Amino acid sequence: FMVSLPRMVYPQPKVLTPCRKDVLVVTPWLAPIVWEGTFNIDILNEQFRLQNTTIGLTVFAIKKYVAFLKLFLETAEKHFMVGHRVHYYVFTDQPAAVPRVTLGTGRQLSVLEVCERRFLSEVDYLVCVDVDREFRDHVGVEILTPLFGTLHPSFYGSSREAFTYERRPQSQAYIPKDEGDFYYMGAFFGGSVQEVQRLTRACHQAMMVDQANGIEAVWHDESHLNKYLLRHKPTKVLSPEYLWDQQLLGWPAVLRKLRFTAVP
Ligand SMILES: [Hg+2]
Ligand SMILES: [Hg+2]
Ligand SMILES: [Hg+2]
């Protein structure tokens, strides 16, 4: 039902001082855009611990991608939801090649060789990411919300006409040039179990419709993700801190932390 926070001592928020003056920190549908400086982690950890929050983390690692699991899981252990209950779900064609990674207390891993309600009974939130990445800094409960997408690192400063949406009206993923909020990357999204299952259900149906019609969206599931989040606005948006490639993009001033990154 949600118990009281304990007494806590922290700096007073200042109404007449913005957290960040260099970036947009709230969407026009009033969803926070999560940048370093916008959140007090101690406050958020308390709120989420008091609810006994469990976070599921899902990765698909097929064929050569199994090689990335060791670094992925080891760095998640250092940086992902530390202090909270975590259930890793590794979807893989090579169950025996999954590295044996030492987990912290309250954390567990299931290997599933390649049923949806499993998630509803096991976790509160689902975080769906690509495996060819490593955590380099804190990725915590600040991301948790009914539905979130992450700003693609190549497009956060782009105007919408430049976004690589599906542009053919024949595709279910079609977005015209005068539409679009952001360009979300397919490599990092999540939310409540119910919201994530709704999204992935919608994108599986749209992709079949397209297959039937002999069309494949320009950026595949990412194109459909972008269509879905246009029409169903995420309740938080994560800044590109949460999906970076320092080799391709460097380290701009506007990024105070590089949290989850492409592997060198
Ligand atoms: Hg997922
Ligand atoms: Hg899909
Ligand atoms: Hg999708």
From Swiss-Prot:
Residues 3-264 are lumenal. The keyword Glycoprotein applies. It is found in: Golgi apparatus, Golgi stack membrane; Secreted. Changing D210N: In allele B104. One of its GO terms (biological process) is lipid glycosylation. Binds 1 Mn(2+) ion per subunit. Keywords: Blood group antigen, Glycoprotein, Glycosyltransferase, Golgi apparatus, Manganese, Membrane, Metal-binding, Secreted, Signal-anchor, Transferase, Transmembrane, Transmembrane helix. The active site is at E222. UDP-N-acetyl-alpha-D-galactosamine binds at F60, A61, I62, Y65, D130, V131, D132. Belongs to the glycosyltransferase 6 family. The conserved DXD motif is involved in cofactor binding. The manganese ion interacts with the beta-phosphate group of UDP and may also have a role in catalysis. This is Histo-blood group ABO system transferase. The lineage of its organism: Eukaryota, Metazoa, Chordata, Craniata, Vertebrata. The chain holds residues 64 to 345 of 354 of the full protein.
